[PDB]
Amino acid sequence: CGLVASNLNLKPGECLRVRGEVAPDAKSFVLNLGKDSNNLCLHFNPRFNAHGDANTIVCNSKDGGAWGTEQREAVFPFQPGSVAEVCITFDQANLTVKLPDGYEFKFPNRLNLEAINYMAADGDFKIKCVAFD
Amino acid sequence: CGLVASNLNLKPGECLRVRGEVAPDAKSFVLNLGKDSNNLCLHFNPRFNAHGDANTIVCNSKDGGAWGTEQREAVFPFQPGSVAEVCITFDQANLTVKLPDGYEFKFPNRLNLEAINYMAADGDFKIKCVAFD
Ligand SMILES: CC(=O)N[C@@H]1[C@@H](O[C@@H]2O[C@H](CO)[C@H](O)[C@H](O)[C@H]2O)[C@H](O)[C@@H](CO)O[C@H]1O
Numbered sequence: 001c002g003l004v005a006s007n008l009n010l011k012p013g014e015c016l017r018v019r020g021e022v023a024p025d026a027k028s029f030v031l032n033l034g035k036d037s038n039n040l041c042l043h044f045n046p047r048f049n050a051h052g053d054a055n056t057i058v059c060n061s062k063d064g065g066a067w068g069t070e071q072r073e074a075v076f077p078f079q080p081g082s083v084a085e086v087c088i089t090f091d092q093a094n095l096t097v098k099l100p101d102g103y104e105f106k107f108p109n110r111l112n113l114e115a116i117n118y119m120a121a122d123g124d125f126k127i128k129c130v131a132f133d
Numbered sequence: 134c135g136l137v138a139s140n141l142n143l144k145p146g147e148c149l150r151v152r153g154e155v156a157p158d159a160k161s162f163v164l165n166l167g168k169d170s171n172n173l174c175l176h177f178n179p180r181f182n183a184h185g186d187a188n189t190i191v192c193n194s195k196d197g198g199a200w201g202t203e204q205r206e207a208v209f210p211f212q213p214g215s216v217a218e219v220c221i222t223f224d225q226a227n228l229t230v231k232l233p234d235g236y237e238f239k240f241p242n243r244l245n246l247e248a249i250n251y252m253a254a255d256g257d258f259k260i261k262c263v264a265f266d
């Protein structure tokens with residue numbers, strides 16, 4: 001696995017910023033946010049070439065070990081072999097993810113945790129920088 | 134406890150940059166670095182006024198759960214209610230903690246691990262930014 005951080009205590013409205021290097025031959029990377037590995041309010045999974053998907057952002061929740069209903073975006077502002085920054089915040093209704101080119105999407109908040117306490121990165125994304133606001 | 138990060142994979146010569154908020158009423162804060170919570174190549178513990186120490190940095194190791202022998206500095210460049218930045222690196226001989234204004238603290242490398250994989254903050258220190266170089 002990649003970087004795992006806990007005790008984040010990220011409250012509604014606070015910004016979590018992650019900057020990393022996307023591998024030149026990247027097939028996929030993951031940012032998981034929530035309470036723990038079984039309880040994710042956001043599974044954020046850009047798929048360059050994985051699970052039969054191409055240049056597709058896949059998002060989901062995981063609640064008590066169970067994947068929720070998957071959602072995808074049409075836009076894919078990531079390139080292999082470049083640096084990517086992602087900024088995440090949430091309120092009780094939605095997570096809001098802002099992407100490098102100013103792209104911003106919302107994913108329903110299905111878990112309604114009081115805070116994001118857990119983040120894990122995986123796959124072809126080398127984290128260089130994590131910041132809190 | 135404060136932020137805990139694992140799978141850091143920080144190798145010799147690589148630089149861990151941490152910026153945090155020292156609480157206004159700070160009595161003590163901690164940065165722990167090593168393999169896991171029981172194997173610390175550096176316990177970095179500025180004590181403003183705790184355990185009978187005043188404005189003293191206490192450093193130690195922990196090896197398979199057992200604390201080593203404490204090393205202490207006279208020089209104390211931390212202030213309560215402020216922002217502190219440190220840059221940490223290690224080699225075969227020492228861990229080095231550097232502050233921007235040029236303070237440099239060295240602690241013997243007692244564990245000789247291949248990497249720092251674990252970092253944890255505790256006490257009156259709120260981490261706001263972590264970077265890898
Ligand atoms: C179990 C399985 O393979 N599920 C398939 C999906 O792949 C998983 O998607 C989740 C997020 O929803 C995680 O990314 C997990 O790592 C993936 O294996 C796949 O996206 C969909 C659509 O093809 O099919 C599921 O069955």
Ligand SMILES: CC(=O)N[C@@H]1[C@@H](O[C@@H]2O[C@H](CO)[C@H](O)[C@H](O)[C@H]2O)[C@H](O)[C@@H](CO)O[C@H]1O
Pocket residue numbers: 176178184185191192193200203
């Ligand atoms: C159990 C205990 O209090 N040990 C004393 C030391 O305090 C601990 O020191 C370690 C680092 O070596 C950690 O900072 C831990 O949090 C502290 O409780 C204390 O520094 C010395 C002398 O002042 O005595 C030890 O027995």
